[PDB]
Design a protein around this ligand. Structure first.
Ligand SMILES: O=c1[nH]c2ccc(Nc3ccc([N+](=O)[O-])cc3Cl)cc2[nH]1
Ligand SMILES: [K+]
Length: 130
């Protein structure tokens, strides 16, 4: 699966999603994970680079000279770990499992994590269901 990209260069259709699939496999097997995120006493292991690529909050934390070395990051204990987990899975898969029963928590968490495209999407779905 390749094509001639808009600039004559060969582009591989599945490459970016295959990279994510493989990063998610690393996460599942706890390979090269370098941070644990703590969400009201639940722990989630991840790769800092993936977090920074997806979240303004994590980008700010891991580019700070003081905080970039921390191996444990605590989030606001009001954050819903289901909400966090939905967003973490999204980061590693492109799939956002929004449901009526989780949308408010997911939106609040995405606001906290500075994930603007997700916040906007949640807003659109809320506005439609009114
Ligand atoms: O042509 C090739 N040969 C490859 C061999 C390995 C990988 N990467 C990989 C495999 C398995 C898991 N895993 O943990 O299941 C995680 C990763 Cl990152 C990619 C390849 N492309
Ligand atoms: K909580």
């Amino acid at each position: 699966l390749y094509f001639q990209g808009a600039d004559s260069c060969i582009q591989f259709t599945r490459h970016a999603s295959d990279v994510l699939l493989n990063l998610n496999r690393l996460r599942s097997r706890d390979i090269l994970t370098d941070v644990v995120i703590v969400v009201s006493r639940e722990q989630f292991r991840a790769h800092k680079t993936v977090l920074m690529a997806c979240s303004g909050l994590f980008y700010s934390i891991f580019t700070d000279q003081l905080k970039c070395n921390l191996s444990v990051i605590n989030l606001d204990p009001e954050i819903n770990p289901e909400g966090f987990c939905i967003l973490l899975d999204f980061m590693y898969t492109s799939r956002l499992n929004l449901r009526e029963g989780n949308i408010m928590a997911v939106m609040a968490t995405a606001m906290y994590l500075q994930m603007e495209h997700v916040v906007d999407t949640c807003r659109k779905f809320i506005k439609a269901s009114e």
